[PDB]
Amino acid sequence: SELLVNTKSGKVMGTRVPVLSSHISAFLGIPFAEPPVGNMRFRRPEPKKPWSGVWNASTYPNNCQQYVDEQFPGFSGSEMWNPNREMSEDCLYLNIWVPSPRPKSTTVMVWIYGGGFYSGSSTLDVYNGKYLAYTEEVVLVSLSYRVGAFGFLALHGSQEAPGNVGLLDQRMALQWVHDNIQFFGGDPKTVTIFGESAGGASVGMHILSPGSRDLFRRAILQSGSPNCPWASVSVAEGRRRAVELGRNLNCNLNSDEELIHCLREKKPQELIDVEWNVLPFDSIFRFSFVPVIDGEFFPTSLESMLNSGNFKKTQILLGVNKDEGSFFLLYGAPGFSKDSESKISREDFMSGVKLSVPHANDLGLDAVTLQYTDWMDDNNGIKNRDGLDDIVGDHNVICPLMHFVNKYTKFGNGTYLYFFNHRASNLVWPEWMGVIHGYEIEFVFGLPLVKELNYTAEEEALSRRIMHYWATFAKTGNPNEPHSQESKWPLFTTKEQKFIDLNTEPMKVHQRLRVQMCVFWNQFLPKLLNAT
């Protein structure tokens, strides 16, 4: 009765799951799209044709076709990110957690996973929405979208494989929530989208895309933003990559129509096996199939939209972690190791710089080297490691986000900036990697409230603060509660540029987050690469 809901696409039968020492309602694996199989591969999503009967919505769905990481088999630190369900091109489903009893028009939070646009799943243990929905009494949605070539193969001009179809997937899950979340207790006019990494960049792209603005109220961006250097490509580069993929598979390259149907015949993992061979450089923190600046989803360049103010004006709550770069060096760089302190010689440092700014010329790599080398001590293995770490995070995550924060605040109505730098007490990774990319997610989603997972009671409190900041921001557009006595998180302003620390210690206010290095990455280095 509570688990039997009559949507505009059919009836859905949920299930009563346990949370903490209570229960709530879960509606798992509801489809919002026609399965993009067959010659519907690479194509714009089509709305799910409505169904008679009762859709069984009591089990997690499939995960989309993606490259599976086998770097450290059996290791929980890395397997926690892999698909925990079967993979299938039939994967466009969403999950809904409803408090119990079902509320009356309560605040909706829609979660978009990251994973560099090539991986990701809605069904991961650390994206379990029961804790956040129960504690803050919000209705928690998590969607999905096609990743890799299946979601972002771009042959602009063709309508067979136009590009950005994985973003269009996310838009159709937002459109479904707009049309149906009211039947679950959710208020369609108070919906907050939020995601991390490629999901944070996705959030920002819906802020900018005109066809997406009317489908959500406000936005949270965690360690990602639409202007990141790994998040977009030109229609030329995306066409170069798509053609290069057909070459790798012996496809007819005479026309698109011939290329697209050649690729539609291959098995999904046939594409995945050659996915990485299309990248133009040797790189870390670069991914093959990503959104394109097509002129449709994005009417002009991202920067000219941020300049003119051509985007949704609302409130945003965003931030970054302390060591966004570390695990990307673990995986792709010389001298690092999961079971070692990972001191790195000057020769490996200059190699890492090359992998990390793969587009620069020699003048640019010299500039980057100069900015992060302590020439009084240039063979200090620790300083070289920490230095290259900061390079990856600053270039790929922090300084792109900071540039997005400064342009958005000009026209927006409320900006709340955070810096996350608590290292979880139970972390399975070596401590040289500090606060790792993606590792604030377990605090956002309430997992420190489970005694079984062996957090400290101060981490439970930190997790409860974050869940509240997030949910309160989702309801009111402001993460602080009026008339309380907890210290207030200040508005980031164009003039004072304030932000807070998120950790177990009392809240400190700082200003100008990593400004010295982001003037280099956002102002000086682009000028030097454009002039040479």
Place this chain on the structure above:
Amino acid sequence: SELLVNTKSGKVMGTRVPVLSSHISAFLGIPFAEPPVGNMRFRRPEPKKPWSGVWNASTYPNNCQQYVDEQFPGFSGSEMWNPNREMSEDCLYLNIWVPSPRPKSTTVMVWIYGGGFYSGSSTLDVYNGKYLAYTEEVVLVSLSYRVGAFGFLALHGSQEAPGNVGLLDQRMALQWVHDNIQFFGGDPKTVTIFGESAGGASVGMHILSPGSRDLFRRAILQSGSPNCPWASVSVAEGRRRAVELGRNLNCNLNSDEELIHCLREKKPQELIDVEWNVLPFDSIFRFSFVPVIDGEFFPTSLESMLNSGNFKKTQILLGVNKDEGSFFLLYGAPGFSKDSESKISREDFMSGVKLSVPHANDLGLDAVTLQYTDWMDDNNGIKNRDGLDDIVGDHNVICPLMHFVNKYTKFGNGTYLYFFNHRASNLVWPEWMGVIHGYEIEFVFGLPLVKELNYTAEEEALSRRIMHYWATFAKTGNPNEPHSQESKWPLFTTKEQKFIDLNTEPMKVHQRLRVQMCVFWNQFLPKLLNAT
């Protein structure tokens, strides 16, 4: 009798001058060149024609024709550098200080005054050679040379105005000393040339010039070196300025002989009046008529000589002051006179960076600006002033010198490096100016030993240490006396790059003098400008 010496050019008779509580011999205004007057203006010096009689060498000679500083009339801090004798083109004379009774073949130190190649005099109170000669029992010579257009008008190809004739003036005074110092008790085989600023750059140039190498033994360079950006010009740039000097005096410009003929009919002060108008840019720490890279005095470019080791191999002692750039900013950048101290606004800072690096394109100016700005605090008047202060010293003095000390030590037979950072307790300048360009000269020459000049007893001790380091180095090629128990000044080597501090505190040994900023000035910025 002691005072009566028979040289290879004639007899000379000096005077018995008092030094502290004693006396020494002094031979003032001895000529070493035919007066470069009339049609000898701008032309290589000719050896003094030997005279009959007794040359009266008991008074200082004239100072060469030069631009006179009238920025702060009557103010000793600046007037102590101005000519204190009459100005005349008949100025090629040298001074000698000889201990009494006359030593037999003792060590000779030859002083070369600085002044940016446009000013300078051997006769200043601060170059009073009597103290160093008496205290260290050395024969102290100070030469002279033509400055400004009179010494460095370069019309390459012409033999009427070739260029570098002021460096040749210096060479002829060194040749005179090589031929005659033995008659005064000096050992022509133990000659040390030493100079500050343009003198230090001159000293380095004699190390480099094959025609000068056999005229001296070792070398001391103070706050100058030959590769400084203000110390040399191409034959083209030198030609462009020589012509533009004639254009300013409405001279014929159809040929070198008519340009030269025109400029020898103008009175000296005419040329001085127009001298500053031929600089290519608005600038500070740039001078109009400087040595030229001609292929005779310097067979190839300064860098190719250093890379290849084409220079005299011996021992050098060299160093810099803490605040080389301050007085160039006081004199030349407004903003340094809008404040009691000299807190400068951010807009004054960006303008100074333009007047300090007069050859950089806007990309180079952004690079300089970015390197010296604290973007957490960019409106700090003190940080802005101090920042541009270092820019002027690092670019013009410290980092040109460190490039020279590193290239030389690969091939040389011994390098000693110093950092002078004492502020005299009796300085007439404001405190923000620090340790000013040229204010170690008073310690080198023993002035703190005069009670009437009210230095502290700790500074008299510092001046005795300096004179000894200088004189011992002049005698043995090493400033330390071994057998001593006093702290030892270590060699600068290619690997450890050690240097010491000169002040009243006990000796400290550092490494890599200002290496972070000199990597910027000496490798990154030159290649930034090479590219654009």
